[PDB]
Design an enzyme around this catalytic site. Structure first.
Site, PDB file in Angstrom:
ATOM      1  N   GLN A 135      27.887  49.422  21.589  1.00 33.18           N
ATOM      2  CA  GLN A 135      28.094  50.743  21.067  1.00 33.18           C
ATOM      3  C   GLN A 135      28.974  50.828  19.873  1.00 33.18           C
ATOM      4  OE1 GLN A 135      26.620  52.907  24.812  1.00 33.18           O
ATOM      5  NE2 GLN A 135      28.467  51.534  24.510  1.00 33.18           N
ATOM      6  N   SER A 171      17.727  55.630  25.225  1.00 32.64           N
ATOM      7  CA  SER A 171      17.198  54.535  24.362  1.00 32.64           C
ATOM      8  C   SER A 171      15.713  54.620  24.113  1.00 32.64           C
ATOM      9  CB  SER A 171      17.336  53.165  24.959  1.00 32.64           C
ATOM     10  OG  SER A 171      18.669  52.829  25.113  1.00 32.64           O
ATOM     11  N   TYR A 229      21.010  43.195  22.287  1.00 34.44           N
ATOM     12  CA  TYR A 229      20.694  44.627  22.268  1.00 34.44           C
ATOM     13  C   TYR A 229      21.821  45.579  21.846  1.00 34.44           C
ATOM     14  CZ  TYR A 229      19.051  49.356  24.031  1.00 34.44           C
ATOM     15  OH  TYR A 229      18.610  50.718  24.191  1.00 34.44           O
ATOM     16  N   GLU A 270       9.176  47.104  23.211  1.00 34.09           N
ATOM     17  CA  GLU A 270       9.214  45.700  23.676  1.00 34.09           C
ATOM     18  C   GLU A 270       7.980  45.511  24.372  1.00 34.09           C
ATOM     19  OE1 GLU A 270      12.649  45.295  26.081  1.00 34.09           O
ATOM     20  OE2 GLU A 270      13.966  46.177  24.410  1.00 34.09           O
ATOM     21  N   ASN A 297      23.177  49.582  20.035  1.00 30.46           N
ATOM     22  CA  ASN A 297      23.071  50.839  19.314  1.00 30.46           C
ATOM     23  C   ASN A 297      23.605  50.839  17.896  1.00 30.46           C
ATOM     24  OD1 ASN A 297      21.817  52.108  21.439  1.00 30.46           O
ATOM     25  ND2 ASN A 297      23.746  52.713  22.242  1.00 30.46           N
ATOM     26  N   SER A 329      18.549  55.743  29.133  1.00 29.18           N
ATOM     27  CA  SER A 329      19.305  56.552  30.154  1.00 29.18           C
ATOM     28  C   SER A 329      20.498  57.114  29.433  1.00 29.18           C
ATOM     29  CB  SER A 329      19.927  55.718  31.327  1.00 29.18           C
ATOM     30  OG  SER A 329      19.005  54.811  31.846  1.00 29.18           O
TER      31      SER A 329
END
Length: 358
Positions: free
Chosen positions: A117, A61, A147, A269, A149, A315
């Protein structure tokens, strides 16, 4: 002093690698705008290659902060506006639910609960289109930050379209090349593979697998030297010759929403410095970091604040990285390891190094 900083990094990174079982690490520390580099372990157990300053780590990320810089750089060029509808850049996305959602919302994970995802059975552009068409919002755009993807992935794929290049090309020619990031890639060339570490998920060697929007969301690989340059550049972009990319950097750290003591930039952030470590250490927990949390809009976006903690964790199956910096202080750290670990652990650790040098 250098032996001092070295002592500092070592008192912390040694027990960390021993207890987290991490085969291979590299950190850089930016201490008064100067970078220091440290290397441990093996990058590759099966080919017997030590970690070096050229080893490439998957960033996860953290790939998302190159996404926001590239977005900002688009913005500075006049090719995109965060206020633009998404359907302006993807008009095939008919469907009443997409009506009113802006680039901003994709970019800052405030569209309405776009899921973490893209489901892994979604394998070509038609399926992705069908995935977005049938997606039903949990919340109205702009109410909550979840949050994702599938959200900022789409920002990045839409953000580059005016350029007429693919995201990967736009990324390389509009960010990586200007910043002299010669060891940073979406696709690792065959002749760079000797440098590409392997990640380790329960003793097994792994690399991130292809998926839709991976480059935009989590597909960047990089050495400590590049990352240390990336940090120095995003901390102080004053020597960036290319004016749209300079500005783009600034816009990456504009504060667009407030979620508690955190303010959501474009991929980066931030929180106000000075702060308390429990802020970033607790907020780094999956329970929280992955929670749908009310989000307070900051319209117009505050320009970038020098007194901030600016950071991103990331990660993959086999890698864990973290990047953080304090513009006001000229101080930052890069942490690249070839085994994932819990993010609380990874922030606690960065904080130990950086608080000792503040």
């Amino acid at each position: 002093t250098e032996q001092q900083i070295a002592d500092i990094v070592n008192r912390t990174i040694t027990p960390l690698m021993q207890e987290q079982a991490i085969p291979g690490m590299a950190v850089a520390v930016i201490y008064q705008g100067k970078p220091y580099y440290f290397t441990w372990g093996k990058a590759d157990i099966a080919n017997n290659h030590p970690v070096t300053q050229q080893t490439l780590f998957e960033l996860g990320s953290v790939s998302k902060t190159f996404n926001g810089v590239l977005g900002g750089d688009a913005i500075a060029r006049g090719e995109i506006k965060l206020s633009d509808p998404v359907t302006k850049y993807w008009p095939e996305l008919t469907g009443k639910q997409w009506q009113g959602i802006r680039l901003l919302h994709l970019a800052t994970y405030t569209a309405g609960g776009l899921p973490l995802q893209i489901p892994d059975d979604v394998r070509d552009k038609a399926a992705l289109l069908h995935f977005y068409q049938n997606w039903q919002p949990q919340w109205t755009p702009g109410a909550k930050r979840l949050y994702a993807n599938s959200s900022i992935g789409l920002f990045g794929a839409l953000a580059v379209k005016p350029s007429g290049m693919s995201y990967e090309e736009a990324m390389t020619r509009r960010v990586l090349q200007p910043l002299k990031l010669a060891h940073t890639w979406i696709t690792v060339p065959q002749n760079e593979q000797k440098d590409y570490a392997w990640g380790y998920r329960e003793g097994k060697p792994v690399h991130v697998s292809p998926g839709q929007l991976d480059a935009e969301a989590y597909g960047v690989k990089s050495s400590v030297i590049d990352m240390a340059r990336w940090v120095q550049a995003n901390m102080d972009a004053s020597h960036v010759q290319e004016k749209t990319l300079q500005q783009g950097i600034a816009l990456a750290q504009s504060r667009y929403w407030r979620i508690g003591d955190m303010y959501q930039g474009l991929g980066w952030e931030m929180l106000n410095w000075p702060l308390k470590a429990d802020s970033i250490i607790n907020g780094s927990d999956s329970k929280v970091a992955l929670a749908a949390l009310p989000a307070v809009e900051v319209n117009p976006p505050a320009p970038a604040v020098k007194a901030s903690w600016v950071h991103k964790t990331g990660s993959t199956g086999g890698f864990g990285s973290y990047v953080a910096f304090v513009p006001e202080k000229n101080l930052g750290i890069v942490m690249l390891a070839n085994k994932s670990y819990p993010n609380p652990v990874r922030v606690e650790a960065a904080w130990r190094i950086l608080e000792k040098l503040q």
